[PDB]
Amino acid sequence: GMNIFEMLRIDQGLRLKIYKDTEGYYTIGIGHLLTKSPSLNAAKSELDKAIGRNTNGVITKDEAEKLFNQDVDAAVRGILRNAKLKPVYDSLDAVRRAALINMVFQMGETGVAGFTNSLRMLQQKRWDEAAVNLAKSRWYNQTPNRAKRVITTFRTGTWDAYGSLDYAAGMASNYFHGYLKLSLPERKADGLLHRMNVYEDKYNVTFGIKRLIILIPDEMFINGVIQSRILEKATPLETQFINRAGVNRPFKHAVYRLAEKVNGKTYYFAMEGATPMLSFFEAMHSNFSATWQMKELKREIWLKFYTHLNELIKTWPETRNLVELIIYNSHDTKGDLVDVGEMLKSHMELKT
Amino acid sequence: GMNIFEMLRIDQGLRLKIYKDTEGYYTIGIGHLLTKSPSLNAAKSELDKAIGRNTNGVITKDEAEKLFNQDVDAAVRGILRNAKLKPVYDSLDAVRRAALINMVFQMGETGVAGFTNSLRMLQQKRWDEAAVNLAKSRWYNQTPNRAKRVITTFRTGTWDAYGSLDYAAGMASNYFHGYLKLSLPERKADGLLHRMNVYEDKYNVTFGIKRLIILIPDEMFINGVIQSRILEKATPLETQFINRAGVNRPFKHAVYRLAEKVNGKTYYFAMEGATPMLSFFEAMHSNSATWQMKELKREIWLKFYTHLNELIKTWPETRNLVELIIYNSHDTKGDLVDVGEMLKSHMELKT
Numbered sequence: 001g002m003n004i005f006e007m008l009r010i011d012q013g014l015r016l017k018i019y020k021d022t023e024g025y026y027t028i029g030i031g032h033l034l035t036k037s038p039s040l041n042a043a044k045s046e047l048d049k050a051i052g053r054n055t056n057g058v059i060t061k062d063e064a065e066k067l068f069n070q071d072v073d074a075a076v077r078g079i080l081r082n083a084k085l086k087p088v089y090d091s092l093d094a095v096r097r098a099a100l101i102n103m104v105f106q107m108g109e110t111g112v113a114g115f116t117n118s119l120r121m122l123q124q125k126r127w128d129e130a131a132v133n134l135a136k137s138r139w140y141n142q143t144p145n146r147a148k149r150v151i152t153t154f155r156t157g158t159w160d161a162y163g164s165l166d167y168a169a170g171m172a173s174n175y176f177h178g179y180l181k182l183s184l185p186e187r188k189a190d191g192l193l194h195r196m197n198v199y200e201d202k203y204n205v206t207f208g209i210k211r212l213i214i215l216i217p218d219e220m221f222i223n224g225v226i227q228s229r230i231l232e233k234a235t236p237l238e239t240q241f242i243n244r245a246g247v248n249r250p251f252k253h254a255v256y257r258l259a260e261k262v263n264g265k266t267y268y269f270a271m272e273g274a275t276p277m278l279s280f281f282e283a284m285h286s287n288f289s290a291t292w293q294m295k296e297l298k299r300e301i302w303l304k305f306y307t308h309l310n311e312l313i314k315t316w317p318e319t320r321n322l323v324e325l326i327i328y329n330s331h332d333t334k335g336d337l338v339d340v341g342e343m344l345k346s347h348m349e350l351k352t
Numbered sequence: 353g354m355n356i357f358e359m360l361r362i363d364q365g366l367r368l369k370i371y372k373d374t375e376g377y378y379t380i381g382i383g384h385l386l387t388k389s390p391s392l393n394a395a396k397s398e399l400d401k402a403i404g405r406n407t408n409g410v411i412t413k414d415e416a417e418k419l420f421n422q423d424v425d426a427a428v429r430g431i432l433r434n435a436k437l438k439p440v441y442d443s444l445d446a447v448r449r450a451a452l453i454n455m456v457f458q459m460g461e462t463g464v465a466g467f468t469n470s471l472r473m474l475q476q477k478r479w480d481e482a483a484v485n486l487a488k489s490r491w492y493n494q495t496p497n498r499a500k501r502v503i504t505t506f507r508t509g510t511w512d513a514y515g516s517l518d519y520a521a522g523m524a525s526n527y528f529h530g531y532l533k534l535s536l537p538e539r540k541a542d543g544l545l546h547r548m549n550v551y552e553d554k555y556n557v558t559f560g561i562k563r564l565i566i567l568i569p570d571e572m573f574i575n576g577v578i579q580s581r582i583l584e585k586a587t588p589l590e591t592q593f594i595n596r597a598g599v600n601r602p603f604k605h606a607v608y609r610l611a612e613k614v615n616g617k618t619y620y621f622a623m624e625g626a627t628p629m630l631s632f633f634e635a636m637h638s639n640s641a642t643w644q645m646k647e648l649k650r651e652i653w654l655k656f657y658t659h660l661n662e663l664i665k666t667w668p669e670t671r672n673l674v675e676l677i678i679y680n681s682h683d684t685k686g687d688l689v690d691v692g693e694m695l696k697s698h699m700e701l702k703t
């Protein structure tokens with residue numbers, strides 16, 4: 001997944017070979033200082049003594065990880081001893097503490113202690129106020145890319161600002177950029193709401209909610225189709241064509257309708273299963289044999305996919321009010337398969 | 353992102369709460385025996401001694417990974433002290449060493465030493481012979497799934513048996529299972545080759561390559577289109593409809609043709625860019641282009657091509673249906689590369 005190592009590999013960068021930092025000092029891995037000597041062989045001697053073998057200037061990714069956590073433990077020790085930094089650290093969460101270790105590695109302890117007013121707002125949990133003040137910082141001007149991510153990590157307490165670099169978040173990002181953000185927002189005279197308005201006027205029907213509903217069950221659909229006792233498949237929305245990767249690509253959204261009246265109305269729904277999860281389920285079934293180890297990993301990817309997808313949809317105004325994510329267990333507590341048509345009927349009743 | 357910890361998390365399993373093994377002994381993490389005492393609080397105190405805090409039976413993934421690396425360090429010390437295992441371990445690279453340590457975690461140090469013939473070919477770096485020899489063992493019979501992944505690690509020296517849940521290899525897996533293998537092979541009387549044969553007969557044209565060409569540039573298409581001075585867009589292939597997660601999904605392929613004849617013939621090509629890389633590039637540009645991210649871009653870009661190419665060749669339904677073209681968007685001079693000249697050169701070679 002995502003942790004402090006992957007975060008600082010983004011902001012600082014990883015080097016499996018010896019390099020020089022901004023002050024010309026020999027360094028390796030993620031900002032692990034070897035020596036202040038201009039001698040390259042003296043830097044190799046310290047590198048060999050730190051790992052236990054004559055690496056001759058090249059180390060493994062695992063060895064670079066075992067150097068980095070030592071520097072994290074050593075940086076925490078100094079943070080706890082520094083009187084200007086320990087009260088902010090003690091009241092911060094681990095994700096925000098990891099963000100607090102981030103600027104420590106970049107500018108040092110004295111530089112982080114310079115932001116006396118921003119640390120005091122983080123200590124008081126005023127996440128929005130210290131986000132605005134770090135934007136005005138000189139550290140923001142020198143590194144505009146890195147300042148935003150540490151700010152958002154302090155403001156949200158999540159790994160959102162570091163994009164999609166693991167398997168789960170990347171499935172949501174490709175889902176988002178390649179389909180949701182691409183085809184649903186109104187662009188030119190076309191878009192999701194436009195297609196639904198043309199659909200409602202053509203068939204004289206009413207959509208229960210004017211959003212694309214995405215089903216994210218923990219298990220793929222039985223027989224690969226949406227199984228329901230009161231929901232039937234209807235004519236899809238008119239296909240919209242969008243140039244994508246050299247193809248005038250057709251994008252189609254399926255439409256289903258309740259076979260039973262709710263409040264005297266037949267409700268339609270533009271909806272679909274979360275097909276990335278289906279492609280993930282299919283890929284996993286071909287490589288692994290459904291052990292308890294895989295079920296935990298599948299559910300872990302399953303949850304992270306929804307959380308990152310829901311975060312991407314909310315942060316972008318073009319898609320904030322266009323998608324409805326429904327994540328659920330395919331079986332109820334009694335063990336029976338959940339009827340998505342019943343879920344939609346109940347949702348329509350709970351507001352009308 | 354795959355390593356020995358994530359490998360044993362696949363094969364053996366990670367439990368963050370104190371549990372009891374097959375012999376009724378309290379265990380934590382990935383098979384870390386805590387104590388043989390029936391006292392649960394004795395297991396909690398022993399776990400507190402190993403972690404360094406009042407866990408009371410529950411630990412985090414980082415603590416369990418740190419505890420697992422200690423168990424690996426102890427297993428390596430035992431392997432180096434074993435005269436039967438030390439020579440092969442010294443000769444093996446880091447990845448193949450993890451496959452050896454995987455077996456020690458499963459059957460113990462004395463069990464791995466019995467593979468005398470098997471350890472010899474590994475020491476002499478005969479990977480294919482060692483992979484065949486290991487498949488004959490009883491260890492392959494009791495636990496076949498775990499053995500095949502360890503044997504492939506000995507055979508290839510990579511993490512290809514386990515790394516399907518990494519970003520690049522995972523996006524290639526979704527790209528392969530959810531699109532390439534889904535819609536290109538021939539189902540009933542439909543598929544890519546059928547659409548291309550219908551296309552050649554309707555328009556009386558000839559495809560230069562009887563495959564779907566997937567362009568993998570290191571940079572997004574300019575204005576989202578394929579730029580070329582000798583390629584031009586033609587009528588696309590007829591759209592194929594496949595039911596997919598409740599949607600009658602359309603699968604359409606664009607067709608391009610060479611603007612100039614190659615020995616009197618105009619050659620057509622079904623081709624498109626790699627949509628997982630386009631989304632990845634779009635996401636990288638939103639979250640700027642420092643050297644840290646430029647190396648990470650090329651890293652995922654390279655790993656996506658290699659794992660997608662492996663999946664295409666592994667399955668016979670797709671082995672001769674896809675043509676992957678990975679290339680730098682600019683030459684050394686800095687000029688933009690015309691993808692059509694690459695295809696014209698491909699055509700001029702055997703025609």
Ligand SMILES: Nc1nc2c(ncn2[C@@H]2O[C@@H]3COP(=O)(O)O[C@@H]4[C@H](O)[C@@H](COP(=O)(O)O[C@H]3[C@H]2O)O[C@H]4n2cnc3c(N)ncnc32)c(=O)[nH]1
Pocket residue numbers: 174175177178179180250251252253254272274275276277278279523526527528529530531532599601602603604627628631
């Ligand atoms: N109802 C509806 N949903 C659509 C349509 N097009 C896409 N979706 C969704 O967007 C996701 C991203 O697809 P992508 O084109 O950006 O790359 C995909 C994906 O990486 C991989 C597996 O697809 P899937 O798991 O179903 O995720 C896709 C889907 O959920 O293969 C790529 N892929 C799938 N189809 C194509 C295609 N025609 N051309 C190129 N790449 C494809 C839609 O039209 N309707």
